[PDB]
Amino acid sequence: AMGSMERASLIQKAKLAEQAERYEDMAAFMKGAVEKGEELSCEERNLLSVAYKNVVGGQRAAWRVLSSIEQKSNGPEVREYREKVETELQGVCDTVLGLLDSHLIKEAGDAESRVFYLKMKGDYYRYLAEVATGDDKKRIIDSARSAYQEAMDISKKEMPPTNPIRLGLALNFSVFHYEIANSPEEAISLAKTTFDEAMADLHTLSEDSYKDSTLIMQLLRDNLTLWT
Amino acid sequence: AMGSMERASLIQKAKLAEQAERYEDMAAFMKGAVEKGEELSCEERNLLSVAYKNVVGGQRAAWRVLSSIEQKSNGPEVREYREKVETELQGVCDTVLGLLDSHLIKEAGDAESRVFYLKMKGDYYRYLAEVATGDDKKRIIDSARSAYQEAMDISKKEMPPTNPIRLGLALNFSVFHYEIANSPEEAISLAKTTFDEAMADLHTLSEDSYKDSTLIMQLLRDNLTLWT
Numbered sequence: 001a002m003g004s005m006e007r008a009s010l011i012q013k014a015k016l017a018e019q020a021e022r023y024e025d026m027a028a029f030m031k032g033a034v035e036k037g038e039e040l041s042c043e044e045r046n047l048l049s050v051a052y053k054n055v056v057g058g059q060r061a062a063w064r065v066l067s068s069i070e071q072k073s074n075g076p077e078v079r080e081y082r083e084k085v086e087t088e089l090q091g092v093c094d095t096v097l098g099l100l101d102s103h104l105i106k107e108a109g110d111a112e113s114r115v116f117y118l119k120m121k122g123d124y125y126r127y128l129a130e131v132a133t134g135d136d137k138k139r140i141i142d143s144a145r146s147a148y149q150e151a152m153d154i155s156k157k158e159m160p161p162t163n164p165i166r167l168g169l170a171l172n173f174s175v176f177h178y179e180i181a182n183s184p185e186e187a188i189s190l191a192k193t194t195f196d197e198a199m200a201d202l203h204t205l206s207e208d209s210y211k212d213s214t215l216i217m218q219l220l221r222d223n224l225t226l227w228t
Numbered sequence: 229a230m231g232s233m234e235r236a237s238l239i240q241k242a243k244l245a246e247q248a249e250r251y252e253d254m255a256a257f258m259k260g261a262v263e264k265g266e267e268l269s270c271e272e273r274n275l276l277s278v279a280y281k282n283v284v285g286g287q288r289a290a291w292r293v294l295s296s297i298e299q300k301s302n303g304p305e306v307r308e309y310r311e312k313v314e315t316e317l318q319g320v321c322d323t324v325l326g327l328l329d330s331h332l333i334k335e336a337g338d339a340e341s342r343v344f345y346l347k348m349k350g351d352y353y354r355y356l357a358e359v360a361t362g363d364d365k366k367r368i369i370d371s372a373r374s375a376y377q378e379a380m381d382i383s384k385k386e387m388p389p390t391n392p393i394r395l396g397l398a399l400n401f402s403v404f405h406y407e408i409a410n411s412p413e414e415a416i417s418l419a420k421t422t423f424d425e426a427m428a429d430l431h432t433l434s435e436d437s438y439k440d441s442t443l444i445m446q447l448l449r450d451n452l453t454l455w456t
């Protein structure tokens with residue numbers, strides 16, 4: 001439905017929708033921009049991520065409330081409504097994963113873009129995994145793992161340990177290990193090594209870069225405190 | 229789309245959607261319940277009002293952000309997106325007004341139901357008026373006025389001055405006078421008389437009723453403080 005709108009107008013309206021807290025609109029505008037076929041700049045990648053993270057975050061919060069009610073109840077209504085919300089969440093994840101596969105990742109040649117999109121691929125398979133059951137589930141978990149792992153391998157070769165995209169990727173992969181893969185030791189090890197290697201590289205940063213990096217390091221610290 | 233779902237299942241799912249903070253879903257479930265054609269109980273009227281007030285409240289907050297940006301800017305993008313949000317807001321108001329006209333109000337014979345629905349009719353024409361311009365606008369303002377006035381006339385004849393529906397109606401009609409009708413003296417007079425008449429009737433209430441009434445009286449007081 002965004003085929004007739006200029007790319008620049010889609011980006012401008014995504015920024016307006018963000019100000020208005022209209023995240024579903026923001027995501028639809030950014031989906032339209034991606035579908036223009038041109039690569040995304042740093043700022044535009046961030047708009048894409050913010051939009052979908054807010055949309056899926058609403059769905060995940062709702063699914064958790066409903067799952068909790070359902071588990072306490074164990075008529076068909078709670079299960080039906082939890083399934084409705086689940087299906088819509090799955091649709092959003094499939095949409096994002098589709099944008100990454102068609103064709104964001106394959107055109108992304110710089111480290112900052114390729115790591116960003118592979119992290120997103122890990123995150124959206126992780127959201128699918130949160131609602132998945134059984135073994136169908138195992139392949140979903142492995143897709144998240146594989147994406148995160150490719151992102152980590154590139155990040156370690158191509159970016160400094162304080163790079164905020166590298167830090168956010170490690171943060172999220174540590175959450176994947178703790179919450180999805182039942183590997184809390186791997187989670188803690190990854191968060192600790194990431195934190196320590198970033199701390200040792202802070203001396204190289206400007207005031208503003210230091211602020212960006214230390215913000216995510218605090219998130220790593222908050223998790224370590226929760227987990228230990 | 230809710231034609232195939234049981235009335236009771238629609239009500240149950242509206243309550244679930246409220247817990248999950250899924251207000252668009254909650255409104256769609258309550259629209260389905262209304263369209264079953266049976267009158268609504270006290271609790272169900274309140275579910276209907278909560279659902280739509282949250283949906284339209286999101287739209288109004290967004291429209292205000294966009295209108296502000298537009299007015300500061302004065303390409304077509306800000307105006308286009310503000311119009312998109314405005315049109316969707318208008319659609320929600322028209323939907324609620326349609327449910328009231330077909331056929332909630334005409335079947336509502338008790339004071340508590342008839343006052344509730346006429347207040348809602350006032351509120352949704354008021355939301356239309358907030359975005360309306362010119363004289364088309366005058367007829368919208370008069371529709372809000374007329375609805376509120378009929379509600380007030382019934383409320384004064386049929387309910388005690390501490391009744392929370394009567395209090396909320398007067399609160400909202402005072403806001404209509406202050407913000408829409410450019411009648412801040414009428415707003416202040418109405419809020420003051422309502423507050424004073426409720427205060428004099430508090431002695432008749434149980435602890436729980438006193439709590440319900442004084443909560444809305446505080447809202448009247450907060451407005452008087454803002455306005456004087």
Ligand SMILES: O=C(COc1ccccc1P(=O)(O)O)Nc1cc(Cl)cc(Cl)c1
Binds near residue numbers: 054
């Ligand atoms: O509360 C959280 C914490 O999740 C973290 C924490 C550190 C890194 C990454 C995440 P995630 O990508 O799971 O949101 N996530 C969350 C956010 C929203 Cl908007 C909804 C829900 Cl249900 C969970």
Ligand SMILES: O=C(COc1ccccc1P(=O)(O)O)Nc1cc(Cl)cc(Cl)c1
Binds near residue numbers: 289400447
């Ligand atoms: O901030 C307010 C205050 O409005 C009042 C105050 C007293 C009585 C009635 C109302 P209203 O029906 O205008 O929301 N309303 C408001 C609520 C949301 Cl969710 C969004 C927006 Cl933009 C305004």
Ligand SMILES: [Cl-]
Binds near residue numbers: 080
């Ligand atoms: Cl459902």
Ligand SMILES: [Cl-]
Binds near residue numbers: 106
């Ligand atoms: Cl490439």
Ligand SMILES: [Cl-]
Binds near residue numbers: 308309312
């Ligand atoms: Cl638009």
Ligand SMILES: [Cl-]
Binds near residue numbers: 334335336337
């Ligand atoms: Cl009647």
Ligand SMILES: [Mg+2]
Binds near residue numbers: 006007
């Ligand atoms: Mg073009």
Ligand SMILES: [Mg+2]
Binds near residue numbers: 083086087
């Ligand atoms: Mg399912």
Ligand SMILES: [Mg+2]
Binds near residue numbers: 107108109110
């Ligand atoms: Mg390229």
Ligand SMILES: [Mg+2]
Binds near residue numbers: 234235
């Ligand atoms: Mg039936």
Ligand SMILES: [Mg+2]
Binds near residue numbers: 314
């Ligand atoms: Mg218009």
Ligand SMILES: [Mg+2]
Binds near residue numbers: 267335336337338
């Ligand atoms: Mg009747």
